[PDB]
């Protein structure tokens, strides 16, 4: 419930430190800029104008203490702290056309764009410089959402194919083997695991569960669906009277939060049981607008807490405010949301 | 396509409910022939159009959420061609079936590939 | 045949196809461009949708990823109504450039055309758009009524004028 | 608690009459105290004072201003009166059942060489006449078809100013036969009998149709009176002499109006029935099945109304109302 | 000005200021100027032979010569008489000014000369009046613009111009001037009655090389023997000669108030556009 007006014009990404003591932007400029907090008052501390364009993907690897963003500058800058100066390095993305995620092993980001093909990069010690291999096989549109597994060798994405494909981005020169998950045995770079159902509407949304179990997304077409290997990949898909959800994340293991062109955050719950998905409702519950946001949301971050117990939700949207969500206070105020 | 005759039998028993709940069933939306299509169109259309305003929110609060979706699309491919004062009837119905679905109904019929 | 509840199905139908959001050119290096005006990717266009209360005044809504073109073809009910429209319609057209929701020529077989760019719809309230769409369309028949009386008026007035003399 | 001190003391001084015999600019200076006390303070310590001894003030107020000579003093006193109408309904029917209503008429009729007065007069006329409770057999000795006539060369004639004054003649017009009667005893209709060459009060009334906006409500009270176009449209197309103020254009024109906010208004509003009416009345007092014109899209909309079964009430009082009219031939 | 001015202010003020420094004895300064008037007039003063005490005002006109055939010399010798002169080289009518030798009063010529092109058009109006006086029936086409052609013909007197209007929307706006002069007989009995013919002339201009089109039309005014009178002669003659004029001087004012009410109009939605911003 702590919404602080930063802008004016819309937000692209949202990136957060390791110790969430500093937070990361980008204002729709050709500069990012990163903030601290020192008190009830915030205060810019650091920024960026290496690329050359709209920035639209940012990450930080918060125990490599390090933040790689690219966007419409069709390049990608793997940005480390250099004394009093954040210096940047141009990793060539090798693309000839929008997303960015660190992996949970921070030893290689996967680049999902506009060239049809999830560009993972990992750093070549003996080269001294980021290369970057694509994978490309049964891909067909932009790769609009990028999230990770628990595992750090698979891969999540949505794409404008109206899918959300499960791929592998598993460079064998980089890490270890990867063990056997119930999404499937053989785990090789592009070999595909699993993909949607979906004939309609685009896949805004997708993130992957902390057990590594399931894999949500959202779509388009007023539509979330969430998958799950445990019970032999199913696909469990429930339509929202609201408009469509632009970012998905889970807060628990069964329950996940997610905004959108609703412009309001809202809480669902899916049962194993049943085999369904539920609906919680409207957590965020009160220009001439009903919401915290102005506009819909953009990006949705956790702040502390995991993927299985969320204590904090960090939301970033069109309206140019940073929404700070806590689950106590949702829950200490809708008393009608079982999480 | 669907079914006349049951439609036809719903329609002369004067139980508008069945025959609407009819109409929508096995919808040509894969369908390639622009034929088929036109005719559950214009099926469905005729199934609207006898309908009494009064009596219109029982039928609509009877059908479900993915009827609501498909009811909406042939109503949007109905509503490309206005003629014999049917426009009324379907405007009254988009506001019922807006009241029903909200705004995720007619954003289904947008995103939709294959629709009527 | 008239009603509030055709602008309200308007106003829903623009409401959902006000979500929007920028997108670069798929095919262009660094161009950045209306996905609903050009066309060139058939993933991106959603399906079309038009709205008829009636059989001459209509408003067809097509909407995109990184677009949302709303054509507007408002009632001809008499000669120098339909005149008047015109030039109306190619006035506010000429001012297209203020105008940045709005396009210099309307839709084939459309009375006006106002293409709402993503980049349109991040730097302006989607509801306030909506709002000033079905706003547009009360003021264009409020308006259009106005401007024929007055005109009617002034002949009146003209002729009294010259046939008093 | 100071202002309600000062207006009373302002009410006790001027009812003391020793401020006719005073100087001007102490009155000047009393009469703008009233007047910005009633304008800048809270409206129930005013509604009390001025209501206060039933109405004593206000009737004080009215007395002081019929037998005063100064025009700037009866500037003010207008402008009081406004905001003390402006203030409840209850000092509306106060002031409205006081003669202040037939003075500001003699005043009207005397003195023309004062502009801005004869303006404030007929806005403050204007709102006193705005609600048509009361109805005086006595103000219609001051205020009738001489009055009408008068207001009607103004409307159709006009003076020789910035001309604010012909629209605000056209509100309190059509404010004075909201409270009128039908139209064998209507003295407005009598006085449109007279003279039918009038055509722009038929232009201007015309304009106020297509505007959709009524001139006559300015404040929100409770129990609100009628729309003054349609009834004062009504009492006009009640009879074919009164109705023989449009001219051959003109009448299609109000056709064309009429029909286009009877087809536009949604069922379930309350002024659909009454363009109905207005309609019907069109089409029985005005020659509508001369020109045979717009009656195929009125037949149409009319055929759309009646199929029309809403459970609600007021469109099935609509349906009556048109199957009431359901002359067709 | 509602009515359209049938003095031209060029020559009246030109005149004056010529007067006001002769009258004062002032040097003789000469004056060269060409100047225009309505349905395609050329007018063209300048002082003859080098010489500064005289002046000479020349007016030209396309229809000149269908003009003198009506007897406009015998009209112009009464109006002008010793002002009249012979015509300047490729000219239609000159008159001619001393400044060695004036009058007194200046307002009457200043004033007469102003209205050289009326005077000028008067003749056939003044002809047909006359005609129409005595009682002779049984008795013409001046084509005054280079598209438009004037018709002018026992109890009445007909006289039926045929204009064009080239815009498409002035058109119908002069389609609804015209709809409201011909019904224009409620608001003063007293006047003349008013016709008008949309694509065909009327029945007395049939056949008679009539130009007919969707763009052409055929006005009829139809004056009596109390508009027709020698006493209201110069008046009407003022008015019916600038009818033409006036109408379309009022059309296109139209389109100007039409104009105002637009930009006005684009002033209040995009007003509401700006309300629809953040800030």
């Known amino acids: 419930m702590a919404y602080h007006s930063f802008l004016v014009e819309p937000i692209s990404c949202h990136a957060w430190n390791k110790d969430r003591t500093q937070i990361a932007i980008c204002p729709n400029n050709h500069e990012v800029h990163i903030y601290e907090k020192s008190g009830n008052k915030w205060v810019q501390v650091h920024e960026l104008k290496e690329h050359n364009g709209q920035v639209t993907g940012i990450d930080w690897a918060p125990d490599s203490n390090r933040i790689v963003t690219c966007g419409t500058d069709r390049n990608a800058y793997v940005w480390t702290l250099k004394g009093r100066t954040w210096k940047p390095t141009l990793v060539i993305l090798r693309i000839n056309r929008r997303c960015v995620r660190w992996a949970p092993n921070e030893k290689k980001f996967a680049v999902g764009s506009g060239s049809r093909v999830i560009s993972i990069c990992y750093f070549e010690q003996e080269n001294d410089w980021w290369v970057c291999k694509h994978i490309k096989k049964p891909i067909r549109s932009t790769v609009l959402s990028l999230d990770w597994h628990p595992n750090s060798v698979l891969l999540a994405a949505g794409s404008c194919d109206f899918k959300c494909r499960i791929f592998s981005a598993y460079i064998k020169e980089v890490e270890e083997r990867p063990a056997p998950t119930p999404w499937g045995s053989k785990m090789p770079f592009g070999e595909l695991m699993f993909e949607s159902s979906s004939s309609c509407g685009w896949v805004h949304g997708v993130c992957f569960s902390a057990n590594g179990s399931r894999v949500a997304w959202v779509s388009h077409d007023s539509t979330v669906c969430l998958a799950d290997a445990d019970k032999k990949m199913a696909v469990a898909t429930l339509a929202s009277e609201t408009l469509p959800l632009l970012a998905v994340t889970f807060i628990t293991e069964s329950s996940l939060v997610a905004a959108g062109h609703d412009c309001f955050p809202v809480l669902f719950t899916y049962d194993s049981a049943a085999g369904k998905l539920s609906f919680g409702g409207r957590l965020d519950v009160p220009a001439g607008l009903d919401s915290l946001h102005k506009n819909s949301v953009s990006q949705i971050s956790v702040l502390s807490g995991g993927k299985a117990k969320c204590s904090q939700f960090c939301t970033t949207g069109m309206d140019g405010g940073m929404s700070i969500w806590d689950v106590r206070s949702l829950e200490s105020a809708l008393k009608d949301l079982k999480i | 396509?669907?079914?006349?005759?049951?439609?036809?039998?719903?329609?002369?028993?004067?139980?508008?409910?069945?025959?609407?709940?009819?109409?929508?069933?096995?919808?040509?939306?894969?369908?390639?022939?622009?034929?088929?299509?036109?005719?559950?169109?214009?099926?469905?259309?005729?199934?609207?159009?006898?309908?009494?305003?009064?009596?219109?929110?029982?039928?609509?609060?009877?059908?479900?959420?993915?009827?609501?979706?498909?009811?909406?699309?042939?109503?949007?491919?109905?509503?490309?061609?206005?003629?014999?004062?049917?426009?009324?009837?379907?405007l009254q119905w988009h506001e019922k079936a807006l009241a029903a679905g909200g705004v995720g109904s007619i954003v289904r019929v947008l995103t939709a590939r294959k629709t009527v | 045949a008239t009603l509030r509840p055709y602008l309200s199905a308007v106003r829903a139908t623009l409401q959902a196809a006000l979500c929007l959001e920028n997108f670069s050119?798929?095919?262009?290096?660094?161009?950045?461009?209306?996905?609903?005006?050009?066309?060139?990717?058939?993933?991106?266009?959603?399906?079309?949708?038009?709205?008829?209360?009636?059989?001459?005044?209509?408003?067809?809504?097509?909407?995109?990823?990184?677009?949302?073109?709303?054509?507007?073809?408002?009632?001809?009910?008499?000669?120098?109504?339909?005149?008047?429209?015109?030039?109306?319609?190619?006035?506010?057209?000429?001012?297209?450039?203020?105008?940045?929701?709005?396009?210099?020529?309307?839709?084939?077989?459309?009375?006006?055309?106002?293409?709402?760019?993503?980049?349109?719809?991040?730097?302006?309230?989607?509801?306030?758009?909506?709002?000033?769409?079905?706003?547009?369309?009360?003021?264009?028949?409020?308006?259009?009524?106005?401007?024929?009386?007055?005109?009617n008026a002034r002949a009146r007035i003209v002729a009294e004028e010259f046939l008093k003399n | 608690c100071h202002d309600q001190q000062r207006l009373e003391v302002i009410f006790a001084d001027l009812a003391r009459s020793w401020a006719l015999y005073e100087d001007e600019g102490v009155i000047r200076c009393y009469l703008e105290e009233l007047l910005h006390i009633l304008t800048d303070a809270d409206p129930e310590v005013c509604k009390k004072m001025c209501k206060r001894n039933e109405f004593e003030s206000v009737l004080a107020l009215v007395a002081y201003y019929q037998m005063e000579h100064r025009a700037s003093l009866r500037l003010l006193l207008l402008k009081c009166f406004g905001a003390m109408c402006s203030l409840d309904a209850a000092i509306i029917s106060t002031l409205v059942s006081s003669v202040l209503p037939v003075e500001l008429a003699r005043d009207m009729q005397t003195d023309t060489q004062d502009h801005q007065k004869l303006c404030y007069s007929a806005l403050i006329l204007a709102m006193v006449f705005s609600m048509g409770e009361a109805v005086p057999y006595a103000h219609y000795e001051h205020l009738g078809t001489p009055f009408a006539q008068f207001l009607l060369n103004i409307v159709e004639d006009g003076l020789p100013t910035t001309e604010?004054?012909?629209?605000?003649?056209?509100?309190?017009?059509?404010?004075?036969?909201?409270?009128?009667?039908?139209?064998?005893?209507?003295?407005?209709?009598?006085?449109?009998?007279?003279?039918?060459?009038v055509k722009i009060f038929s232009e201007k009334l015309l304009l106020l149709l297509n505007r959709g906006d009524d001139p006559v409500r300015i404040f929100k009270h409770e129990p609100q009176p009628p729309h003054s176009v349609l009834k004062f449209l009504q009492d006009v197309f009640g009879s074919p002499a009164t109705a023989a103020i449009f001219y051959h254009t003109d009448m299609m024109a109000l056709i064309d109006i009429t029909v286009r906010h009877i087809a536009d208004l949604s069922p379930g509003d309350k002024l659909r029935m009454e363009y109905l009416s207005l309609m019907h009345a069109i089409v029985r007092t005005t020659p509508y099945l001369q020109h045979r014109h717009r009656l195929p899209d009125l037949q149409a909309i009319l055929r759309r109304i009646l199929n029309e079964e809403e459970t609600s009430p007021q469109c099935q009082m609509d349906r009556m109302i048109v199957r009431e009219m359901c002359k067709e031939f | 000005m509602i009515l359209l001015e049938v003095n031209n202010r060029i020559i009246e003020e030109t005149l004056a200021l010529k007067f006001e420094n002769a009258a004062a004895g002032n040097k003789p300064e000469a004056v060269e100027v060409t100047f225009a008037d309505f349905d395609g007039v050329l007018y063209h003063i300048s002082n003859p032979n080098g010489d500064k005490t005289k002046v000479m005002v020349s007016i030209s006109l396309k229809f000149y010569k269908e003009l003198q055939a009506h007897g406009?010399?015998?009209?112009?010798?009464?109006?002008?008489?010793?002002?009249?002169?012979?015509?300047?080289?490729?000219?239609?009518?000159?008159?001619?000014?001393?400044?060695?030798?004036?009058?007194?009063?200046?307002?009457?010529?200043?004033?007469?000369?102003?209205?050289?092109?009326?005077?000028?058009?008067?003749?056939?109006?003044?002809?047909?009046?006359?005609?129409?006086?005595?009682?002779?029936?049984?008795?013409?086409?001046?084509?005054?613009?280079?598209?438009?052609?004037?018709?002018?013909?026992?109890?009445?007197?007909?006289?039926?111009?045929?204009?064009?209007?080239?815009?498409?929307?002035?058109?119908?706006?002069?389609?609804?001037?015209?709809?409201?002069?011909?019904?224009?007989?409620?608001?003063?009995?007293?006047?003349?009655?008013?016709?008008?013919?949309?694509?065909?002339?009327?029945?007395?201009?049939?056949?008679?090389?009539?130009?007919?089109?969707?763009?052409?039309?055929?006005?009829?005014?139809?004056?009596?023997?109390?508009?027709?009178?020698?006493?209201?002669?110069?008046?009407?003659?003022?008015?019916?000669?600038?009818?033409?004029?006036?109408?379309?001087?009022?059309?296109?004012?139209?389109?100007?108030?039409?104009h105002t009410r637009m930009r006005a109009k684009t002033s209040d939605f995009l007003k509401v556009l700006n309300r629809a911003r953040p800030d």
Do not use: W
Not at chain 2, 15 to 26: E, F, G, P, R
């Open chain 3, 25 to 151: 050119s798929q095919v262009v290096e660094r161009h950045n461009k209306p996905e609903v005006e050009v066309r060139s990717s058939k993933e991106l266009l959603l399906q079309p949708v038009t709205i008829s209360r009636n059989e001459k005044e209509k408003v067809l809504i097509e909407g995109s990823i990184n677009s949302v073109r709303v054509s507007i073809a408002v009632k001809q009910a008499d000669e120098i109504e339909k005149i008047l429209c015109h030039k109306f319609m190619r006035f506010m057209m000429m001012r297209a450039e203020n105008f940045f929701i709005l396009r210099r020529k309307p839709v084939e077989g459309y009375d006006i055309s106002f293409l709402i760019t993503n980049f349109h719809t991040e730097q302006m309230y989607k509801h306030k758009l909506v709002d000033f769409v079905i706003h547009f369309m009360e003021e264009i028949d409020k308006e259009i009524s106005e401007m024929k009386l007055s005109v």
């Open chain 2, 1 to 90: 396509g669907p079914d006349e005759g049951e439609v036809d039998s719903c329609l002369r028993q004067g139980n508008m409910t069945a025959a609407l709940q009819a109409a929508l069933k096995n919808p040509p939306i894969n369908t390639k022939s622009q034929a088929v299509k036109d005719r559950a169109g214009s099926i469905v259309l005729k199934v609207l159009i006898s309908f009494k305003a009064n009596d219109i929110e029982k039928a609509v609060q009877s059908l479900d959420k993915n009827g609501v979706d498909l009811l909406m699309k042939y109503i949007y491919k109905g509503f490309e061609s206005p003629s014999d004062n049917s426009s009324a009837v379907l």
């Open chain 4, 164 to 197: 604010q004054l012909p629209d605000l003649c056209v509100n309190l017009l059509l404010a004075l036969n909201l409270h009128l009667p039908a139209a064998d005893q209507n003295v407005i209709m009598a006085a449109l009998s007279k003279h039918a060459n």
């Open chain 5, 72 to 258: 406009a010399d015998e009209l112009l010798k009464r109006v002008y008489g010793s002002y009249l002169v012979n015509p300047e080289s490729g000219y239609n009518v000159s008159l001619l000014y001393d400044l060695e030798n004036l009058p007194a009063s200046k307002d009457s010529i200043v004033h007469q000369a102003g209205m050289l092109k009326r005077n000028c058009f008067a003749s056939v109006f003044e002809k047909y009046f006359q005609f129409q006086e005595e009682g002779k029936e049984g008795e013409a086409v001046i084509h005054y613009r280079d598209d438009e052609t004037m018709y002018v013909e026992k109890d009445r007197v007909t006289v039926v111009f045929s204009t064009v209007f080239k815009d498409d929307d002035d058109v119908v706006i002069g389609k609804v001037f015209m709809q409201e002069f011909k019904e224009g007989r409620r608001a003063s009995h007293t006047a003349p009655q008013v016709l008008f013919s949309h694509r065909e002339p009327p029945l007395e201009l049939k056949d008679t090389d009539a130009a007919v089109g969707d763009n052409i039309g055929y006005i009829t005014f139809v004056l009596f023997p109390r508009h027709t009178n020698a006493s209201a002669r110069d008046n009407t003659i003022n008015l019916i000669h600038t009818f033409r004029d006036y109408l379309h001087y009022h059309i296109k004012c139209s389109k100007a108030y039409i």
